[PDB]
Design a protein around this ligand. Structure first.
Ligand SMILES: Nc1ncnc2c1ncn2[C@@H]1O[C@H](COP(=O)(O)OP(=O)(O)OP(=O)(O)O)[C@@H](O)[C@H]1O
Ligand SMILES: Nc1ncnc2c1ncn2[C@@H]1O[C@H](COP(=O)(O)OP(=O)(O)OP(=O)(O)O)[C@@H](O)[C@H]1O
Ligand SMILES: Nc1ncnc2c1ncn2[C@@H]1O[C@H](COP(=O)(O)OP(=O)(O)OP(=O)(O)O)[C@@H](O)[C@H]1O
Ligand SMILES: [Ca+2]
Ligand SMILES: [Ca+2]
Ligand SMILES: [Ca+2]
Ligand SMILES: [Mg+2]
Ligand SMILES: [Mg+2]
Ligand SMILES: [Mg+2]
Lengths: 319, 319, 319
DNA sequence: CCCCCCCCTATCGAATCCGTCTAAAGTTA
DNA sequence: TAACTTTAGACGGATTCGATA
């Protein structure tokens, strides 16, 4: 795991400076080593000499140089993937949701995004040999659609206990964009004490549709969204967790020659499109069956799979 | 290749001055000869007389005068071009990616920038008669989307061995703009010992969108980006490698100007527009096919070509 | 042609003073006659009495008095103009590029500055009755985008010999502002022996953007630019060559008053604005067609024209 | 041949683009 | 017992420094 920030104290830094860094938002040596000088300067009690000394001391404990592709391949071969509860989706994703990156799921209503989030929140607590991540879960809720009964129903299927499954989920509700960004600092503070395997934001872009209204507020909205996504990436790199965000759709009214993937576009613009690593397009099939399509990925071919929303969570279609 | 800076000691320079120069970031005689006097002055242990003597000796060791266009033509006729793995793109570029200059590829998401980067990283190790550059590769990664399995697939396509292909790639991950600029000094130090042929930065402008937010920081952002591009150009000139960078896009919301010409504009502004030599525009086609268009070039006419992203890298569309 | 500085020996000047002046950078009687006293004083081996004697002899050898406007009209009616390869541009400029003055072309990327420079470099060698200048071309390259194949294409278009066209062009690459200024002394040295007709600097302000960074270095940058422009003007006056330089653009990010048309401004400021005699503004049209506009001139009305970039250089739009 | 002091002046020189949103409407035995 | 097409508007935003005889 990451090294606590207290190591800098014996590395040769004043305890007051470490305290100031702690209230700034940094809680590990890695978080300090990943920040630019201008971010540390903004702290009231930090001067240029203090900043460069802190950066030089932090750079010794964290490797930030060159390496080979063989070492990276060996390190990545030991990464953890979390099963989704459906064999078809697992085969489509070649194992399940990866850790250390950002995954995004978008689609129209009743397509099964909250259901997948609930199933993953339950599943991330299984032992590794059974397909789990063996950790706790964090659930930042934006719309107000969190239902623990679905968690209990999913936990019943895998033969776990309901009480300690509900004990391992942390829930928070965000009421505006400022609160949504503020919750991430407390999330970073919490992750040093225990071990977390998953962090869920649902929905990521729901409040930006209303907080910033017209074309006159577009640039500020995009800048705020970019800052939020950068913080999410920093958390994923620092703690090695899996981040799953949820998006919405918008219509195309120009009536031009676009008939593939329907006149549906995910909201957020180019910012969220470039930031995300994997994008999944969710569509409705027949009855309780849905269709999942690989929309964007650096290593996964474009394909399709079929799953269903059963009484015990997300599972294969019963035919 | 370039001359090591140790020759200045024989030319009559104190070894301590050479050590100071190496600590500053100059590892070859060419890097010293190309630097202005005010850059050498900034070093703590160098005076005006020492700078003048060093510059005089370096100029004595490097040809920096007038020549004839016939000699330039003869020298350029022996340049090395690296194939992209697609016949259509090779015909469009009249041979492939050209060393000694900066090439930029931009477009929206899943258009194929990272796939082309992986294919080039594998291909730059082929023998010259087979379309390669016969050298190692350097991959500075910004977003966290490096996947060695794609490298293994592309290597399997060409019949090479996976192990040494992975051994011949150097990987580094940048976490901020300062770290991204800092990695170039280590790259310059590395390139003296072994022969390289390609250097990928992907993405080159991803961290600038978030490190500097508003209009109040535009000037500093542009200055930092200009300095980074100048360092890249100096590396390309000194070592004769091919530099390939990757860019993103921004929307035009001003109104009903222009026409339906895909109102997407690359980011970076006039600095990156003027600095780049060749610019490639990537567009999404149908299925797995993509379209590449020549956006800017001093010797290549505007045209288009089609390629596909197959299971073994970038190649021609199978129709 | 100008009188070589060796003529002063017959006027009562020691060879020591003559070679000291030559080492200083003076190679003709006109150069000495136009220089102020303090410039001669700055030379180590020249005292005040020697400087006064040299100035008196030079003023004897060179006419520096009052004349009438009819004589000026008669001498100006014999001026030489070089065609640009396009009939409409020649009509706009009323003959072509004038010798003895400084012309500046600016615009954004792929607007056709380098193509025009290549076309002019080939064209300046045609016979006078064909629209040429009957001389050699000097090309000072700053960015590294010199391609002799375009020269070969234009020479093939005009039915010349490619070998001779390539042989009659002198090429030099500049790496910093100091080198850019230092190359002018060698240019002045070479212009004495052979008859040159064109001097191209492309780009003139590319290195000034990165060599001097912020507002703290504005004054030194502007003074260096002013000295460079003054030396260019001295060369144009002394040898009667045509001086064509290239500029870049910068965005305007405030004050939407009379600026909604085009928020593009050339760089360099009032120094280059006042120094330049004629300024041309290039725009992007449709396809391969571009638009040229008169931005500043002492004798030409403000108008517009249209040209195109073809496979054989700059020509007329094929409609 | 002898023994002690006086006083400021004058401005220069521009840079740097960003960021998408919004579905509607039945018809003809 | 089936096959059928058109439609248009909308805006705001901020900061930067050195140079002498
Ligand atoms: N216990 C259950 N058994 C079966 N299906 C259920 C159960 N609970 C919910 N569903 C299904 O969940 C579907 C809605 O999925 P979900 O709540 O994930 O929507 P969503 O994609 O998040 O939508 P929105 O954009 O409105 O938030 C419904 O169509 C319903 O059939
Ligand atoms: N093994 C594979 N087989 C087929 N297609 C693949 C494979 N791996 C990736 N792809 C394709 O690669 C595409 C994404 O391309 P790429 O990763 O180069 O995007 P990009 O241009 O770098 O985007 P971004 O701006 O998100 O970084 C996907 O659409 C996917 O279909
Ligand atoms: N052989 C050719 N045939 C047709 N067009 C060509 C040919 N070679 C180059 N071009 C055109 O030249 C254009 C670029 O022109 P040029 O190199 O003069 O640009 P520029 O304004 O000098 O740019 P920069 O600011 O980057 O230096 C491209 O848009 C390309 O279409
Ligand atoms: Ca992406
Ligand atoms: Ca360019
Ligand atoms: Ca003028
Ligand atoms: Mg939901
Ligand atoms: Mg990518
Ligand atoms: Mg050019």
């Amino acid at each position: 795991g990451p090294q606590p920030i207290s190591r800098l104290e014996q590395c040769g830094i004043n305890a007051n400076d470490v305290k100031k860094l702690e209230e700034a938002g940094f809680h590990t040596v890695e978080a300090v080593a990943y920040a630019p000088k201008k971010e540390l300067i903004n702290i009231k009690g930090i001067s240029e000499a203090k900043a460069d000394k802190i950066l030089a001391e932090a750079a010794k404990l964290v490797p930030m140089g060159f390496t080979t592709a063989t070492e990276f391949h060996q390190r990545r071969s030991e990464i953890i993937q979390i099963t989704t509860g459906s064999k078809e989706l697992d085969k489509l994703l070649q194992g399940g949701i990866e850790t250390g990156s950002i995954t995004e799921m978008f689609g129209e209503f009743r397509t099964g995004k909250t259901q997948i989030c609930h199933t993953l929140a339950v599943t991330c607590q299984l032992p590794i040999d059974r397909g789990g991540g063996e950790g706790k879960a964090m659930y930042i809720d934006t719309e107000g659609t969190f239902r623990p009964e679905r968690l209990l129903a999913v936990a019943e299927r895998y033969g776990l206990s309901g009480s300690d499954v509900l004990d391992n989920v942390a829930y928070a509700r965000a009421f505006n964009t400022d609160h949504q960004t503020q919750l991430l600092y407390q999330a970073s503070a919490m992750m040093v004490e225990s071990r977390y395997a998953l962090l869920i934001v649902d929905s990521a872009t729901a409040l930006y549709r209303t907080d910033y209204s017209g074309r006159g507020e577009l640039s500020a909205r995009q800048m705020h969204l970019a800052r939020f996504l950068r913080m999410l990436l920093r958390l994923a790199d620092e703690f090695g967790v899996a981040v799953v965000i949820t998006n919405q759709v918008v219509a195309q009214v120009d009536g031009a020659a676009m008939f593939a993937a329907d006149p549906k576009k995910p909201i957020g613009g180019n910012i969220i499109a470039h930031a995300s690593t994997t994008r999944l397009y969710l569509r409705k099939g027949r009855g309780e069956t849905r269709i999942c399509k690989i929309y964007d990925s650096p290593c996964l071919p474009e394909a399709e799979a079929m799953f269903a929303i059963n009484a015990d969570g997300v599972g294969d279609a019963k035919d």
